[PDB]
Amino acid sequence: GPMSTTEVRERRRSYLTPVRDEESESQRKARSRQARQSRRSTQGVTLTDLQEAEKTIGRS
């Protein structure tokens, strides 16, 4: 008869049926990675450090 794998196969492929998100997610990351790396590279900028310091937070 038919195979049961066809059920987990189609459901497993849907996880990324629309790759459109994989393209925008990879593009937005490459822009922020190279952008933040260029800013901190030239210097601290006294601006990007404020955002990173708030995200890192300091607890005990």
Swiss-Prot record:
Key regulator of protein phosphatase 1C (PPP1C). Mediates binding to myosin. As part of the PPP1C complex, involved in dephosphorylation of PLK1. Capable of inhibiting HIF1AN-dependent suppression of HIF1A activity. This is Protein phosphatase 1 regulatory subunit 12A. PP1 comprises a catalytic subunit, PPP1CA, PPP1CB or PPP1CC, and one or several targeting or regulatory subunits. PPP1R12A mediates binding to myosin. Interacts with ARHA and CIT. Binds PPP1R12B, ROCK1 and IL16. Interacts directly with PRKG1. Non-covalent dimer of 2 dimers; PRKG1-PRKG1 and PPP1R12A-PPP1R12A. Interacts with SMTNL1. Interacts with PPP1CB; the interaction is direct. Interacts with ROCK1 and ROCK2. Interacts with isoform 1 and isoform 2 of ZIPK/DAPK3. Interacts with RAF1. Interacts with HIF1AN. The chain holds residues 658 to 714 of 1030 of the full protein. Residues 29-39 have a biased composition (Basic residues). The lineage of its organism: Eukaryota, Metazoa, Chordata, Craniata, Vertebrata. Expressed in striated muscles, specifically in type 2a fibers (at protein level). It is found in: Cytoplasm; Cytoplasm, Cytoskeleton, Stress fiber. The modification Phosphothreonine is found at residue 42. The modification Phosphoserine is found at residues 38, 41. Heterotetramerization is mediated by the interaction between a coiled-coil of PRKG1 and the leucine/isoleucine zipper of PPP1R12A/MBS, the myosin-binding subunit of the myosin phosphatase. The KVKF motif mediates interaction with PPP1CB. Phosphorylated by CIT (Rho-associated kinase). Phosphorylated cooperatively by ROCK1 and CDC42BP on Thr-42. Phosphorylated on upon DNA damage, probably by ATM or ATR. In vitro, phosphorylation of Ser-41 by PKA and PKG appears to prevent phosphorylation of the inhibitory site Thr-42, probably mediated by PRKG1. May be phosphorylated at Thr-42 by DMPK; may inhibit the myosin phosphatase activity. It is linked to Genitourinary and/or brain malformation syndrome: An autosomal dominant syndrome characterized by multiple congenital anomalies including urogenital malformations and brain abnormalities ranging from agenesis of the corpus callosum to anencephaly. Residues 19-28 have a biased composition (Basic and acidic residues).
